[PDB]
Coordinates of N, CA and C and ligand atoms in Angstrom, one line a residue:
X1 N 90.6 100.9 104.7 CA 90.5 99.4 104.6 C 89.1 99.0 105.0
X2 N 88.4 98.1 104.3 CA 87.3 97.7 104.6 C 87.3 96.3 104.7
X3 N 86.7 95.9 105.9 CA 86.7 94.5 106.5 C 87.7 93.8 106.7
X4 N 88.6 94.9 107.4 CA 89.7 94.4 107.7 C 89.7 94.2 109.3
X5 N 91.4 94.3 109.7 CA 91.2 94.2 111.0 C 92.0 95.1 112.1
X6 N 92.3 95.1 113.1 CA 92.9 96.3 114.0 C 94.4 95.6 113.8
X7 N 95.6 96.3 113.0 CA 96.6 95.6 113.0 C 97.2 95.0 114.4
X8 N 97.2 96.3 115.4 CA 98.2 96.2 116.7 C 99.2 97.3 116.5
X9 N 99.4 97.9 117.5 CA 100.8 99.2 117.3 C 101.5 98.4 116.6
X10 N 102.3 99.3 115.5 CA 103.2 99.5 115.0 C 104.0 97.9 114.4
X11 N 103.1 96.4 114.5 CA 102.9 95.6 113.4 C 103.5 95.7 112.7
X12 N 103.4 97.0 111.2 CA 103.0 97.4 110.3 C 104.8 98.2 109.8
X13 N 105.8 98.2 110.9 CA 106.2 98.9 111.2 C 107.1 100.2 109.6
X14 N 106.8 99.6 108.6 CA 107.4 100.0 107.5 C 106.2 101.2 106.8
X15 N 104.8 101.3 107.5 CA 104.0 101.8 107.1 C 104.0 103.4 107.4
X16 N 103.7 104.0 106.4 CA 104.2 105.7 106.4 C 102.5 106.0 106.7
X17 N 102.1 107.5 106.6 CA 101.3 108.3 106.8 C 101.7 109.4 106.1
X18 N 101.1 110.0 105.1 CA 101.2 111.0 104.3 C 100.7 112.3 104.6
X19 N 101.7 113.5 105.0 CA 100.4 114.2 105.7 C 100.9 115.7 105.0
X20 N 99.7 116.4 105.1 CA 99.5 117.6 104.0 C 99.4 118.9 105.1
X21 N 98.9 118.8 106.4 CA 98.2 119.1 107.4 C 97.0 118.2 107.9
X22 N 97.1 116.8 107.1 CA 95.5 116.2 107.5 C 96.6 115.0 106.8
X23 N 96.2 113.7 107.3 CA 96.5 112.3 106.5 C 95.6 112.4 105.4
X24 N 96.9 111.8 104.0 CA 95.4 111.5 102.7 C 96.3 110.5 102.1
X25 N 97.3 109.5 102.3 CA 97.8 108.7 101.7 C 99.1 108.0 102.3
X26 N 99.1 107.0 102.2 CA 100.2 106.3 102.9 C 101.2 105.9 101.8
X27 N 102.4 105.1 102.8 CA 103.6 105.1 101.7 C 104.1 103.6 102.4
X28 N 105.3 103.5 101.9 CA 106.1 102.3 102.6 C 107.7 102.4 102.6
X29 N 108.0 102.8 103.8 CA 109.8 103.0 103.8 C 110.3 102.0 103.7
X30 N 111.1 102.3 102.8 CA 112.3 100.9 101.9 C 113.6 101.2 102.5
X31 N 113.8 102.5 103.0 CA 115.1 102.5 103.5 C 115.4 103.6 104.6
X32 N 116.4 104.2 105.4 CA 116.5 105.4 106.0 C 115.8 106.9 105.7
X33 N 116.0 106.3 104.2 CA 115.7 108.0 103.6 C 114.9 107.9 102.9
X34 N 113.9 106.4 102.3 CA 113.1 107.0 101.5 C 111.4 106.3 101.4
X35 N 110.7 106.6 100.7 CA 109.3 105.7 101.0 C 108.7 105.6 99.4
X36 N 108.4 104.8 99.2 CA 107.6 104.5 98.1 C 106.2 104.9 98.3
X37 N 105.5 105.7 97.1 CA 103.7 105.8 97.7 C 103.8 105.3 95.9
X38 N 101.8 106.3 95.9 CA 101.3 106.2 94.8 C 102.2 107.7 94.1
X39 N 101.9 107.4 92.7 CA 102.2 109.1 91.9 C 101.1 109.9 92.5
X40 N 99.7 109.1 92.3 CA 98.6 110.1 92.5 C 98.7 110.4 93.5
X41 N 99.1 110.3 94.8 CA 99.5 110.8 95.7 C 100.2 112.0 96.0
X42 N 100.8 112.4 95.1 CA 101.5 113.3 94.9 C 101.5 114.8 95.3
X43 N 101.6 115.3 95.9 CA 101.6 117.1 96.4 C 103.0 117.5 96.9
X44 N 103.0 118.7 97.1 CA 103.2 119.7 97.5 C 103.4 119.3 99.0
X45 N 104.6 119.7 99.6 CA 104.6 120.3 101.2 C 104.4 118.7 102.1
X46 N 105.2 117.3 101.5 CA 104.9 116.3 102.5 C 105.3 116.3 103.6
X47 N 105.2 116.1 104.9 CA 105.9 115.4 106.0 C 105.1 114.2 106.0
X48 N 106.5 113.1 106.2 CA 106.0 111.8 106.3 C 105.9 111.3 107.9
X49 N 105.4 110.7 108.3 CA 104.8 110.1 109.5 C 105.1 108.9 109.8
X50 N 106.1 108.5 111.0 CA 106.7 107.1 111.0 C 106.0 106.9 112.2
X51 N 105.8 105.3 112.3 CA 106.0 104.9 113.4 C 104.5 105.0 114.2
X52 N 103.7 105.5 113.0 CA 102.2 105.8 113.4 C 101.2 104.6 113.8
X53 N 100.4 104.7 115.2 CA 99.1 103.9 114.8 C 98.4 104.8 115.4
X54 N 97.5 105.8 116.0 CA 96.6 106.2 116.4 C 96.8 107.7 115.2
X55 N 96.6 108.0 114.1 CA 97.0 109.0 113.7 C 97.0 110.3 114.0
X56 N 95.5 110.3 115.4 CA 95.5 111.4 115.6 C 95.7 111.8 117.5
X57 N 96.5 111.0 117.4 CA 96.9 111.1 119.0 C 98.3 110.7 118.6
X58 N 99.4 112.3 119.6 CA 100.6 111.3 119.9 C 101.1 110.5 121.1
X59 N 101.4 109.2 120.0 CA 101.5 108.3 121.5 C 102.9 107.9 121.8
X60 N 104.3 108.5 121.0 CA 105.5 108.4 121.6 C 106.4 108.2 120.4
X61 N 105.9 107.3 119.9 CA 107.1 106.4 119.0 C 107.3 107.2 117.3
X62 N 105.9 108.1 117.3 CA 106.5 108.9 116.0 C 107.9 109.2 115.6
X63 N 108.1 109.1 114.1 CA 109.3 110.2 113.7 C 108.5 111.3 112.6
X64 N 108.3 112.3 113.0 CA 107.8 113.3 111.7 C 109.2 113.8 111.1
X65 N 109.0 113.6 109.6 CA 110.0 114.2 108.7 C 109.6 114.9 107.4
X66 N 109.6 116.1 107.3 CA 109.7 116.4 106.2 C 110.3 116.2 104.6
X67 N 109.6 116.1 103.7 CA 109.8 115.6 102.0 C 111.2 116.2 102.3
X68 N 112.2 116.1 101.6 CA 113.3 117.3 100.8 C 112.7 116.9 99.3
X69 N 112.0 116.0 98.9 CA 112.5 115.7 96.8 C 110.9 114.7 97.1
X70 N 110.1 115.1 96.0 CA 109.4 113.7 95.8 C 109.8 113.3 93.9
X71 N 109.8 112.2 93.7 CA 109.9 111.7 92.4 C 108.7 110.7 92.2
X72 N 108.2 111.2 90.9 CA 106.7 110.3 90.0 C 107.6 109.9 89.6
X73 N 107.5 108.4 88.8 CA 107.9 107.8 87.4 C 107.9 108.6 86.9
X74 N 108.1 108.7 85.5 CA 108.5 109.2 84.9 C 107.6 108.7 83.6
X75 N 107.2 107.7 83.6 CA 106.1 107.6 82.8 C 104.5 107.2 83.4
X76 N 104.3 107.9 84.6 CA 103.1 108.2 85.5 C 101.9 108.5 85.1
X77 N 100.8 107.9 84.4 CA 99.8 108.5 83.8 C 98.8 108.8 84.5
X78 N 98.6 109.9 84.6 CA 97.6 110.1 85.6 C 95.9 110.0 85.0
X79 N 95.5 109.5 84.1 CA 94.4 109.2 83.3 C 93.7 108.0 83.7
X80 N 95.1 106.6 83.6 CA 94.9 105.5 83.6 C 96.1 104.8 84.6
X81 N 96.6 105.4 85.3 CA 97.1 105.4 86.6 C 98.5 103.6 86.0
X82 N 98.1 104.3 85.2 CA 99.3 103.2 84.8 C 101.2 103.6 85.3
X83 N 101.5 103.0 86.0 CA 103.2 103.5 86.8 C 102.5 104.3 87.9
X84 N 101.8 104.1 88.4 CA 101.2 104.7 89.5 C 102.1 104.4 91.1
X85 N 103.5 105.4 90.8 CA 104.6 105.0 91.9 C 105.1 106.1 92.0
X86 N 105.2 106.6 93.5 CA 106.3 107.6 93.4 C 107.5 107.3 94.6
X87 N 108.4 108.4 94.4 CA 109.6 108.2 95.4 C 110.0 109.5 96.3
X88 N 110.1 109.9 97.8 CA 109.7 110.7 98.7 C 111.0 110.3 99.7
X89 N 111.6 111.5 99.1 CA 113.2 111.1 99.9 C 112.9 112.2 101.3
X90 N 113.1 111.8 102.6 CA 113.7 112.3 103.9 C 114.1 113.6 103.7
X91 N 114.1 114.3 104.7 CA 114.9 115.8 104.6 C 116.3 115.0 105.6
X92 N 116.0 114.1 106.5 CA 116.9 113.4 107.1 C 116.5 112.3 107.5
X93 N 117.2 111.3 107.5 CA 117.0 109.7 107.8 C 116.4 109.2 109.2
X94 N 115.4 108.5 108.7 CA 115.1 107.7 109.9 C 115.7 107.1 111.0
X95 N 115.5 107.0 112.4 CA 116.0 106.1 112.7 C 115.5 105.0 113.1
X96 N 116.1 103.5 112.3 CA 115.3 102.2 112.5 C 115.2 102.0 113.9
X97 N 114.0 101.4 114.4 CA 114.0 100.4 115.6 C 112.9 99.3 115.3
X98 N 112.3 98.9 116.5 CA 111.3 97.7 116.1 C 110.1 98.5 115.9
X99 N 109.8 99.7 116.2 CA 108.1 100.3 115.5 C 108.8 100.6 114.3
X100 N 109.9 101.7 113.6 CA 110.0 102.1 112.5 C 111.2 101.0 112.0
X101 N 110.4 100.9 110.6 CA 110.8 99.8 110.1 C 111.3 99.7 108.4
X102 N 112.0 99.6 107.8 CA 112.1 99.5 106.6 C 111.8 98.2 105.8
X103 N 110.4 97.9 104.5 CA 110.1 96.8 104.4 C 111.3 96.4 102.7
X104 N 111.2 95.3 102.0 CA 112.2 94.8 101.5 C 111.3 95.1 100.1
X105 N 112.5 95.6 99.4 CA 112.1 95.4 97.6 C 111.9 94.0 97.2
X106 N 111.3 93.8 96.4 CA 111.0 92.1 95.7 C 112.0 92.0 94.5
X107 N 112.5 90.6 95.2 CA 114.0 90.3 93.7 C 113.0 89.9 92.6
X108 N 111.8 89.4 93.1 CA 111.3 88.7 91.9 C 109.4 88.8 92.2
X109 N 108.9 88.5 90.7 CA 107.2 89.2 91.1 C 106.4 88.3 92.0
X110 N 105.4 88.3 92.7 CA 104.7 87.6 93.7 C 103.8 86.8 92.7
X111 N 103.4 85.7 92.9 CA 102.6 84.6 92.3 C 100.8 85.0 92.5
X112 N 100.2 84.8 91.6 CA 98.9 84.5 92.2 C 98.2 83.7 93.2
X113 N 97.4 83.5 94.0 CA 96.7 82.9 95.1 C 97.5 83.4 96.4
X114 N 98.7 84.2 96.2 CA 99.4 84.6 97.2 C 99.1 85.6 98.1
X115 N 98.9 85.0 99.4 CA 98.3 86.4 100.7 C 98.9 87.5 100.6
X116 N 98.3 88.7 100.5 CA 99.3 89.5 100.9 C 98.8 90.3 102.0
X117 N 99.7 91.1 102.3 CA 98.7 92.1 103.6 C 99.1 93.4 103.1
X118 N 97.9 94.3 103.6 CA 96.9 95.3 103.2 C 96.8 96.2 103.8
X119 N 97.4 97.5 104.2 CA 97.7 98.3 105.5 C 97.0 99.9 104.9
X120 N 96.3 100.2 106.2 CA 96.2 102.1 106.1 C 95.3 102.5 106.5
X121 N 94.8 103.9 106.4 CA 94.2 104.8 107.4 C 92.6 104.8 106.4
X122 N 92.7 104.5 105.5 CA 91.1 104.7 104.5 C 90.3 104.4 105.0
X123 N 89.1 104.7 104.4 CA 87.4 104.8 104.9 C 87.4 103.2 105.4
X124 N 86.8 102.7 106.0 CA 86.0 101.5 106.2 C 84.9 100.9 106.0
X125 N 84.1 101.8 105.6 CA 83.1 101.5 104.7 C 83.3 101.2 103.6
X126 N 82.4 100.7 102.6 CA 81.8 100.3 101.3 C 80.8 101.4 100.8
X127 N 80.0 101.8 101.6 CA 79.5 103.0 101.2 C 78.8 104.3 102.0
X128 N 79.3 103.9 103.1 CA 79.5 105.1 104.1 C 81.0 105.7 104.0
X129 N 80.8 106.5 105.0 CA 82.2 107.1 105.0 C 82.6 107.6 106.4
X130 N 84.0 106.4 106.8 CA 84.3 106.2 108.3 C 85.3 106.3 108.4
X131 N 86.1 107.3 108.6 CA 87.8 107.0 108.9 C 88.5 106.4 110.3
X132 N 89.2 105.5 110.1 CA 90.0 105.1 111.8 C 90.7 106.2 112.3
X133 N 91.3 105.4 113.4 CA 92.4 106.4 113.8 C 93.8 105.5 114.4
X134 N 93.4 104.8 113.8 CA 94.1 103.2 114.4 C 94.5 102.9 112.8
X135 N 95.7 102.2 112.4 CA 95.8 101.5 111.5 C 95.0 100.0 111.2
X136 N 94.6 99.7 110.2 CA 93.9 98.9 109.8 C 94.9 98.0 108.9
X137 N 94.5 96.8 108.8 CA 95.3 95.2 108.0 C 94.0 94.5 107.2
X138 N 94.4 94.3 106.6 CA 93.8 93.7 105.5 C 94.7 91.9 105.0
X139 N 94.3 90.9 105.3 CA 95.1 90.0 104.0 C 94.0 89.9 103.3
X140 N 94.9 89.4 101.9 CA 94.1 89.4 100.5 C 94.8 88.7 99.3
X141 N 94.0 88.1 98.7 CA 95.2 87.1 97.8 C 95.1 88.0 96.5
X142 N 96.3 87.7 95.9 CA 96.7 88.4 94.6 C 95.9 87.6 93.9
X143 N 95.0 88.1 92.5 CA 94.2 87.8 91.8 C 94.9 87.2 90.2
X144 N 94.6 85.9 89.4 CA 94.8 85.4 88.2 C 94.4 86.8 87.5
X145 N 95.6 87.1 86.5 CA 95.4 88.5 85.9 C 93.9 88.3 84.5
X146 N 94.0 87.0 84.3 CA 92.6 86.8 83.6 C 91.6 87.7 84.6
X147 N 91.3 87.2 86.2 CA 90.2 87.4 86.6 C 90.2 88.9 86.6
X148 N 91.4 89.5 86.7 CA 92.0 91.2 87.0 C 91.4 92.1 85.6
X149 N 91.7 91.4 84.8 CA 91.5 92.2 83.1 C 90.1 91.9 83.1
X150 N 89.2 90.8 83.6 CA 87.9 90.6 83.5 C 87.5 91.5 84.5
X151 N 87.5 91.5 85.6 CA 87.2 92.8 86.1 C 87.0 94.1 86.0
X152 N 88.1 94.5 85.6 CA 89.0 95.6 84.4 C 89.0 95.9 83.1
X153 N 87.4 95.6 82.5 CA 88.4 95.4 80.8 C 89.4 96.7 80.3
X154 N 89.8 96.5 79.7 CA 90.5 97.7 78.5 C 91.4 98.2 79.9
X155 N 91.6 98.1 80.8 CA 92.2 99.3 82.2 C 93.1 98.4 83.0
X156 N 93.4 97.3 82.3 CA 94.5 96.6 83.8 C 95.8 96.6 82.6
X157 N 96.6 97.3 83.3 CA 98.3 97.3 82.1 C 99.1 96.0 82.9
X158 N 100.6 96.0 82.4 CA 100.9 94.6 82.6 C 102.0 95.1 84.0
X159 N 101.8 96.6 84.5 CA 102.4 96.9 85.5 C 101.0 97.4 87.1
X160 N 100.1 96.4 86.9 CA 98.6 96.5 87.7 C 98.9 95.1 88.1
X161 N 98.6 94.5 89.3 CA 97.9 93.5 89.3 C 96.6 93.6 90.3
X162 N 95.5 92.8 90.3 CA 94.5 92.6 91.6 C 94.7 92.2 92.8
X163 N 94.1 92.4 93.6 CA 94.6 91.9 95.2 C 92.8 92.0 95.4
X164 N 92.6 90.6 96.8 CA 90.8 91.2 96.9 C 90.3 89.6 96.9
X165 N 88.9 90.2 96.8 CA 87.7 89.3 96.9 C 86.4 89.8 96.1
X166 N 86.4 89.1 94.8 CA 85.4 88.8 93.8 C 84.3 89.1 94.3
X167 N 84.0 89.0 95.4 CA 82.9 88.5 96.1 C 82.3 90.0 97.1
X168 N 83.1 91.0 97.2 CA 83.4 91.9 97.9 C 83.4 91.7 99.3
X169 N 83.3 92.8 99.8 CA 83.4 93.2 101.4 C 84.9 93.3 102.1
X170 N 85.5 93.1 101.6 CA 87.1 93.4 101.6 C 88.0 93.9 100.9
X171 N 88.7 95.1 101.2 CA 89.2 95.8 100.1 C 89.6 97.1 100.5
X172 N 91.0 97.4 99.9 CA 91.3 98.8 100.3 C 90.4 99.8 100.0
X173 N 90.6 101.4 100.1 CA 89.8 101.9 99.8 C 90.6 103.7 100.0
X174 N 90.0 105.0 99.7 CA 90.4 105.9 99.7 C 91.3 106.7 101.0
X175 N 92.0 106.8 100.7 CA 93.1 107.2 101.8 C 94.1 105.9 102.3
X176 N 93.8 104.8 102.0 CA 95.0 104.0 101.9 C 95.9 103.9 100.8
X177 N 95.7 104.3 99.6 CA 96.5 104.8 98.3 C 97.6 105.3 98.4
X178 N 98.7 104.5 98.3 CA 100.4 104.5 98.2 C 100.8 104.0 99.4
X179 N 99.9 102.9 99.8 CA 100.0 102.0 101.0 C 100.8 100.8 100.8
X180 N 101.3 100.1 101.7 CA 101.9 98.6 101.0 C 100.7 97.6 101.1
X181 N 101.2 97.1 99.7 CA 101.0 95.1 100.0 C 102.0 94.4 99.9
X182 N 102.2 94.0 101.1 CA 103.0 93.1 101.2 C 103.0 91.7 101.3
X183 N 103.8 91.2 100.4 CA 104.0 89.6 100.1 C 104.8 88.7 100.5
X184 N 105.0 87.8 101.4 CA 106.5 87.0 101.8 C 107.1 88.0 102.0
X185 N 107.0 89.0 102.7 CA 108.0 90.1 103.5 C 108.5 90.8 102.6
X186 N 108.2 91.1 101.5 CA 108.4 92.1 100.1 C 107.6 92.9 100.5
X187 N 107.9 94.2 99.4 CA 106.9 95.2 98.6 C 106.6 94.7 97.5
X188 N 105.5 94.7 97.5 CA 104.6 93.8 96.0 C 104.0 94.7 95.7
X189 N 102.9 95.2 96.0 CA 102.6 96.3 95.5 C 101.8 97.9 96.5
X190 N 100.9 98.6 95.7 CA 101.1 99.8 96.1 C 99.4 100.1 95.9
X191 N 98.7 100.6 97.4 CA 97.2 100.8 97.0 C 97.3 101.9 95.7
X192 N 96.7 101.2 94.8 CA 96.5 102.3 93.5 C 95.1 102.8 93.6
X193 N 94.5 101.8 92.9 CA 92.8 102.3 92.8 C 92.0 100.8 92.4
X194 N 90.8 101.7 91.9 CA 89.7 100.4 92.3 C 88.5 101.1 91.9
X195 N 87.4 100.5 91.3 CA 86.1 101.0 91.5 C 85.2 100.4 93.0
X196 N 85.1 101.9 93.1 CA 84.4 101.9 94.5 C 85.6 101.4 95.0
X197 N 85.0 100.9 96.4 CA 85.6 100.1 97.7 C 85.0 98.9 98.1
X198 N 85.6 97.2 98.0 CA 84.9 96.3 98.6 C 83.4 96.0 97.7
X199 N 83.6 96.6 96.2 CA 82.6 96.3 95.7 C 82.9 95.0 94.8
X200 N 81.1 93.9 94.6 CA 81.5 92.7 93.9 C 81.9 93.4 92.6
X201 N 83.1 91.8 92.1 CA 83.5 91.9 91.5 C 84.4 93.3 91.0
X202 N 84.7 93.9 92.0 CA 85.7 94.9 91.7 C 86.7 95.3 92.7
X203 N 87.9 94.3 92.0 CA 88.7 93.9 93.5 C 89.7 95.3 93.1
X204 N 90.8 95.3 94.5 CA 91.6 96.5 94.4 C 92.5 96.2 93.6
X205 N 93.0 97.3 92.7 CA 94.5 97.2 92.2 C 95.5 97.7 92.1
X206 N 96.5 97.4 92.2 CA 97.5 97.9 92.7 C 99.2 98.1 91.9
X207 N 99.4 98.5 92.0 CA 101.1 99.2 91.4 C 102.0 98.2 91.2
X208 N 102.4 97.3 90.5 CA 103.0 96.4 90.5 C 104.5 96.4 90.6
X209 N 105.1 96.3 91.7 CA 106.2 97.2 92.2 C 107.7 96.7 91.8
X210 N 107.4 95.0 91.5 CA 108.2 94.0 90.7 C 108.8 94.9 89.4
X211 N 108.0 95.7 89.1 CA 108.7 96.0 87.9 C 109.4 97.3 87.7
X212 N 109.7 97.9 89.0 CA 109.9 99.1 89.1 C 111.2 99.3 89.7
X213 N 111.9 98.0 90.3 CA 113.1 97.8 91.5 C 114.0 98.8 90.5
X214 N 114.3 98.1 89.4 CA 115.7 99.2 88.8 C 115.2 100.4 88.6
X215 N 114.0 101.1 88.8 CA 113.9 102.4 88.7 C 114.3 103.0 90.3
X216 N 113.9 102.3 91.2 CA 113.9 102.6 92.5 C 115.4 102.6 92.7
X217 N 116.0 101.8 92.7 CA 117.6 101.4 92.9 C 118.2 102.9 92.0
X218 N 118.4 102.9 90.4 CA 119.0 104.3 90.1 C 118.8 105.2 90.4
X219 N 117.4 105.5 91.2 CA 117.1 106.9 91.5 C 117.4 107.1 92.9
X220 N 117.6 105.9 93.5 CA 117.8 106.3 95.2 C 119.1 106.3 95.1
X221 N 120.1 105.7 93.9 CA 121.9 106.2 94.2 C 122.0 107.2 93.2
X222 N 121.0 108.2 93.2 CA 121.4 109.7 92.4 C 121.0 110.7 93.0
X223 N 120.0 110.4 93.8 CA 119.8 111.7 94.8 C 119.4 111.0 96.2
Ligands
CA301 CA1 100.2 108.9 116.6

């Protein structure tokens, strides 16, 4: 996150850590057993990371759990990052309290001019390269998809929307990818991508998660 701010422990409390042997992508637990990230996110060998804010100090409240199943869409393009959503079931269920936290699917899509907030472990720079070790917050208003597709030409699908500032200096960035935005206490959407980080006129975009609930709901009462 760039130009963002120090959220506070565990705030965030729905916010995952994706880890390979090293953090490279965040997620958002929707329920006991499962977390929503990016597809491109995607590997081999997850344990997911609850309850994190210092990522590289343990400070108590973690749950480390290993993947049993990850699921891409199924129509996941990895070219043009269109359905850029995946699903990352538990080997065993969380257990909720007030740091680990499960955030809410959206009955219906978030509006434009709407804050959302902007969570994860990515660079902080714009064009250095600085990782925390603290979770970072971001708010950011959802972008008129005119300004999104003008930003975007030919590259924003109608399952993208923008989050950000035209103007730069704020803006997710690399290693927050399959992170939440969250909207009026939804999942709205999901750090996708973006040219550069915090650069003008090239706000973040993100997974538009509105459109994906009945894929999320059939696939989490089938395995
Ligand atoms: Ca920690």
């Amino acid at each position: 996150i760039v130009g963002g701010y120090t959220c506070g422990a565990n705030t965030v409390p729905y916010q995952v850590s994706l880890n390979s042997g090293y953090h490279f992508c965040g997620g958002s637990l929707i329920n006991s057993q499962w977390v929503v990230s990016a597809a491109h996110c995607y590997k081999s060998g997850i344990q997911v990371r609850l309850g994190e804010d210092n990522i590289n100090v343990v400070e108590g409240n973690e749950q480390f759990i290993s993947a049993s199943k990850s699921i891409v869409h199924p129509s996941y393009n990895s070219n043009t990052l269109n359905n850029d959503i995946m699903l990352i079931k538990l080997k065993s269920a969380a257990s909720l309290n007030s740091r680990v936290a499960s955030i809410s699917l959206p009955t219906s899509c978030a509006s434009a001019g709407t804050q959302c907030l902007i969570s994860g472990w990515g660079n902080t720079k714009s064009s250095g390269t600085s990782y925390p070790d603290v979770l970072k917050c971001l708010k950011a208003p959802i972008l008129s998809d005119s300004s999104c597709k003008s930003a975007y030409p030919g590259q924003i699908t109608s399952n993208m929307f923008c989050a950000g500032y035209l103007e730069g200096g704020k803006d997710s960035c690399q290693g927050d990818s399959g992170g939440p935005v969250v909207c009026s206490g939804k999942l709205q959407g999901i750090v996708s991508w973006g040219s550069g980080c915090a650069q003008k006129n090239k706000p973040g975009v993100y997974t538009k998660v509105c459109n994906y609930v009945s894929w999320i709901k059939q696939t989490i009462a089938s395995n």
